[PDB]
Design a protein around this ligand. Structure first.
Ligand SMILES: FC(F)(F)c1ccc(OC2CCNCC2)nc1
Ligand SMILES: [Cl-]
Ligand SMILES: [Mn+2]
Ligand SMILES: [Zn+2]
Ligand SMILES: [Zn+2]
Length: 453
């Protein structure tokens, strides 16, 4: 009745030995956590990263948020940290007529789900969300300014979210294109009820979230295997969310009661993330939540070797949806292959397998377009073109292995799945533009094998 909290997601308390290597640890808990989509990680009691900031010199531009269930919000779009904190505490204090920390978390949760489902209430809140910048930096130590001995100890921690993307078992650790959205941490300043709508990460990546300080962040998570179930429920109740969008900056997302999902047989788990704790989201695991009060979090995307095959599947799914890519998965694979001699050996082995599938798929595609009567061809360094100059006109995929052009429509490309979609000219007028021949690729494949042994 009213709100039934979902069951608790898994909570892990690794020893320092377990904890020291984030990638080994994540791989370890994966059979458990991937069944629940999210999990919480409590670091060893003495892992205590130093937090320090001047609340008067940190500025940011707030986003405003209406709180209505099923209402469309867009994924992306001046306070000091102090003036925001004052506004945030006053809001929670006045809303509940209580001291801001005496408000029970159970109560804030039940109240959140009441207020979002009521048309009459028009509660609006504000929050901060931006990548690390010079005007507002990471909450973790970074090199620059003389650091304290305590800060230096955490500079190279695997769990320092600045390091995670560039560590050795990370797969995005070598991507050329400056995907600032996916290897840089994001900073989040929350207040009571400010919420993150249901979503999955770009390219179905992992995310790792650290709550540096403040009141808890409440999470709901859904395991990856249930992603399409959830989408079907949402399509049915809010179809306006699923119309086509002109770019990445136009994704539509919404607040939705997890009990609604649970009624439709979608497994949902919850947690309250407190200061000093990590939440990890797994590939294609839907998640949402809201902040209990004034707080400060930091989060980053990442991709492990476990993720690589899912990344390929995600881009295929993006193609089916005519959804824009953040980067080319094939380009990332080939970039790594080209650096095989310095790859971690397990990484080399995993990349080799994805590359084999890529090559077999590419062979079949090239044979198909040849049979359609595309004969002329020319090598092309796709990686040099801005993304918006190499997207398939039909399905918006970022091209890299190959594409079709026609002199009839200068600058336009289709991927090889959409050869019929470029123009009315006969295919013999087309050119196949390709990055590699088979012969270019097999030394790269062999290098990976040698590195992998
Ligand atoms: F996977 C690549 F290496 F890119 C690749 C794959 C296939 C290809 O052409 C095939 C298919 C058409 N006949 C010759 C072999 N050329 C290059
Ligand atoms: Cl409302
Ligand atoms: Mn997320
Ligand atoms: Zn296409
Ligand atoms: Zn043409």
């Amino acid at each position: 009745s009213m709100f039934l909290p979902p069951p608790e997601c898994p909570v892990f308390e690794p020893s320092w030995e377990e904890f020291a290597d984030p990638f080994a640890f994540i791989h370890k808990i994966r059979p458990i956590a991937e069944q629940t989509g999210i999990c919480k990680v409590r670091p060893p009691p003495d892992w205590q990263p130093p937090f320090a900031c001047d609340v008067d010199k940190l500025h940011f531009t707030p986003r405003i948020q209406r709180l209505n269930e099923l209402e469309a919000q867009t994924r992306v779009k001046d306070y000091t940290l102090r003036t925001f904190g004052e506004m945030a505490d006053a809001f929670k204090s006045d809303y509940f007529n209580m001291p801001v920390h005496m408000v029970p978390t159970e109560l804030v949760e039940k109240e959140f789900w009441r207020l979002v489902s009521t048309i009459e209430e028009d509660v609006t809140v504000e929050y901060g969300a931006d990548i690390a910048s010079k005007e507002f930096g990471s909450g973790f130590p970074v090199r620059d300014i003389k650091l304290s001995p305590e800060e230096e100890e955490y500079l190279d921690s695997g769990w320092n979210l600045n390091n995670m993307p560039v560590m050795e078992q990370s797969v995005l650790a070598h991507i050329t294109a400056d995907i600032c959205g996916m290897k840089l941490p994001w900073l989040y300043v929350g207040m009571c009820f400010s919420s993150f709508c249901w979503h999955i990460e770009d390219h179905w990546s992992y995310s790792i979230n650290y709550l540096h300080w403040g009141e808890p962040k409440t999470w709901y998570g859904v395991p990856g295997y249930a992603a399409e179930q959830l989408e079907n429920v949402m399509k049915k109740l809010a179809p306006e969310l699923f119309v086509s969008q002109p770019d990445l900056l136009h994704q539509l997302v919404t607040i939705m009661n997890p009990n609604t999902l649970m009624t439709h047989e979608v497994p949902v788990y919850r947690t309250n993330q407190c200061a000093g704790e990590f939440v990890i989201t797994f590939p294609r695991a839907y998640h949402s939540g809201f902040n209990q009060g004034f707080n400060f979090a930091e989060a980053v995307n990442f991709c492990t070797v476990d993720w690589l095959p899912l990344g390929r599947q995600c881009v295929e799914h993006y193609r089916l949806l005519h959804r824009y890519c953040v980067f080319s998965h094939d380009e990332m694979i080939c970039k790594m292959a080209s650096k095989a001699d310095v790859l971690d050996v397990v990484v080399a082995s995993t990349v080799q397998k994805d590359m084999a599938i890529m090559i077999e798929d590419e062979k079949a595609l090239r044979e198909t377009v040849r049979k359609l009567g595309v004969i002329d061809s020319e090598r092309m360094d796709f990686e040099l073109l801005p993304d918006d100059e190499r997207q398939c006109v039909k399905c918006k995929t970022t091209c890299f292995m190959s594409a079709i052009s026609c002199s009839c429509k200068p600058g336009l490309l289709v991927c090889l799945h959409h050869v019929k979609e470029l123009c009315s000219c006969p295919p013999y007028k087309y050119k196949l533009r390709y990055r590699y021949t088979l012969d270019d690729l097999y030394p790269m494949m062999n290098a990976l094998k040698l590195r992998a042994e």
